[PDB]
Ligand SMILES: Nc1cccc2cc(O)cnc12
């Protein structure tokens with residue numbers, strides 16, 4: 615959940 | 625890849641690293657004489673096991689967040705599929721933090737910069753993981769002895785992260801090419817700077833893995849003793865990486 619969000623955050 | 629290209633990669637990795645430092649090296653050196661008093665150390669030792677675990681998990685999560693940003697800025701990482709990105713960060717984030725930690729370690733007096741001051745390993749006694757703490761201190765002592773430059777840490781940590789042997793990688797050949805390019809960037813820079821003497825002095829294969837496994841083992845003991853503390857007060861990213 616968290617890791618996916620950090621990687622998608624631009 | 626060619627010579628100008630390899631140097632372009634060296635410059636890029638070093639910039640990516642400098643932009644994603646949580647702590648400035650100059651700030652860490654300038655804080656060396658700011659050491660916790662016997663009263664402050666005692667204060668840390670008097671803290672409950674759960675209170676100390678939560679503070680350390682939060683500080684580790686913050687350090688991991690900077691490692692995530694380093695990965696995103698690392699040339700070739702955002703080009704890998706999301707599965708491979710997650711695999712590389714789940715296996716490598718903690719290993720990168722363990723390497724970055726040698727900068728906050730003062731080998732002259734065996735102290736670490738923690739929560740505004742420098743303190744010895746006795747600071748962490750309330751955690752109940754003395755073996756793990758002393759191993760991370762010994763590891764930090766060993767890297768500090770190498771006199772790592774910021775550029776060397778940048779190149780070395782880029783290689784800690786881009787590891788093609790990680791179980792679960794789908795585009796293994798793509799990670800292998802990115803790894804070989806970073807290896808050339810790393811070795812070219814050491815050659816250029818007359819620092820190839822450090823290659824033989826670098827941590828053995830399995831040492832970072834051993835520290836990460838011990839961290840996960842100690843967290844599992846702690847979780848067994850205080851499950852509500854982990855569930856309710858541990859950061860979501862920390863639980864995602866280390867709990868399950
Ligand atoms: N190098 C290190 C080893 C162990 C603990 C640490 C805590 C810190 O806050 C900074 N560095 C550390």
Ligand code: NA
Pocket residue numbers: 726727728729730731764768
């Ligand atoms: Na150091």
